[PDB]
Amino acid sequence: KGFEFTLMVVGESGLGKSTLINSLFKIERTVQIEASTVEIEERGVKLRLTVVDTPGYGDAINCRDCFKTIISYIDEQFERYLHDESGNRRHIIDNRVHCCFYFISPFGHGLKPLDVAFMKAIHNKVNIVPVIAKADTLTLKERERLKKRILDEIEEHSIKIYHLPDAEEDEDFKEQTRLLKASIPFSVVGSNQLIEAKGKKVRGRLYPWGVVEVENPEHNDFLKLRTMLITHMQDLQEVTQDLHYENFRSERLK
Ligand SMILES: Nc1nc2c(ncn2[C@@H]2O[C@H](COP(=O)(O)OP(=O)(O)NP(=O)(O)O)[C@@H](O)[C@H]2O)c(=O)[nH]1
Ligand SMILES: [Mg+2]
Numbered sequence: 001k002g003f004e005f006t007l008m009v010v011g012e013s014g015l016g017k018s019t020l021i022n023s024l025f026k027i028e029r030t031v032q033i034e035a036s037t038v039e040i041e042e043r044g045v046k047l048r049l050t051v052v053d054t055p056g057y058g059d060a061i062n063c064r065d066c067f068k069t070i071i072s073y074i075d076e077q078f079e080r081y082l083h084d085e086s087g088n089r090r091h092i093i094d095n096r097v098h099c100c101f102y103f104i105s106p107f108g109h110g111l112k113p114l115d116v117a118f119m120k121a122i123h124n125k126v127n128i129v130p131v132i133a134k135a136d137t138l139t140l141k142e143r144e145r146l147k148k149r150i151l152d153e154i155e156e157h158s159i160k161i162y163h164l165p166d167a168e169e170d171e172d173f174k175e176q177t178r179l180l181k182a183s184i185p186f187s188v189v190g191s192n193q194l195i196e197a198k199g200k201k202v203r204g205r206l207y208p209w210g211v212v213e214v215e216n217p218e219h220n221d222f223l224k225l226r227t228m229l230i231t232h233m234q235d236l237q238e239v240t241q242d243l244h245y246e247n248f249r250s251e252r253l254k
Contacts, residue, residue, distance in 0.1 A: 004048040011103030013056030015133035020190035078248040100126040103133040110149030127162035135187035186221035
């Protein structure tokens with residue numbers, strides 16, 4: 001009994017993409033597409049979590065090149081899945097990208113022109129979850145001003161984004177659902193380093209005026225992103241099967 005899920009991370013270079021995924025479950029600049037895998041096996045359950053790191057655009061890599069290589073990768077995993085399906089292989093190993101975190105610079109008006117290009121290049125091929133990178137550069141009012149616009153410009157530009165399901169019908173879930181739905185785009189902070197924050201070493205951003213904690217819900221939206229991801233793996237998977245994969249199958253079998 002096997003379950004496989006693949007997460008991709010995408011966006012402008014230097015937005016802390018590699019740092020955040022290393023932090024999810026000397027850390028150099030990402031030059032090519034790099035996949036890392038976490039295989040959990042016990043009893044008769046075999047979980048496979050793949051994380052696809054991508055080189056960001058704008059520093060040594062021009063945006064058109066960057067999303068061409070990313071699109072190429074996504075279409076390849078569709079290709080592979082189709083081939084395994086094209087003969088019967090009723091039990092396949094699934095490499096499709098079921099979720100893509102789009103990292104947005106905190107320094108922008110909302111989505112910069114190149115971001116809109118990128119997102120629209122891939123929004124029909126993958127579930128996009130937009131995140132505000134390096135949120136420790138942002139005041140709470142600044143976070144909120146940015147969050148609104150990103151959402152506004154996503155609508156303005158007809159950018160297709162993964163939306164959460166809700167209500168199967170329950171109470172504790174009713175809150176967590178509306179909360180997570182409201183806190184999008186998540187403003188996140190990542191850290192590769194641990195700092196003595198009184199009695200236990202927590203990650204992890206040491207400034208002379210204070211310390212930023214990755215896993216403090218009041219500092220940033222990391223745990224919210226992480227729990228959103230865990231608890232919605234199944235929906236994200238079905239949608240890429242029913243909507244994104246079908247549109248691939250649409251064109252290639254034609
Ligand atoms: N302010 C701030 N800086 C961060 C944060 N996370 C990482 N950084 C810094 O940003 C640097 C670049 O991080 P990195 O994860 O490599 O970014 P990237 O998006 O993967 N870069 P690339 O796309 O070029 O490979 C890190 O070396 C770290 O010093 C964060 O949450 N906040
Ligand atoms: Mg990187």
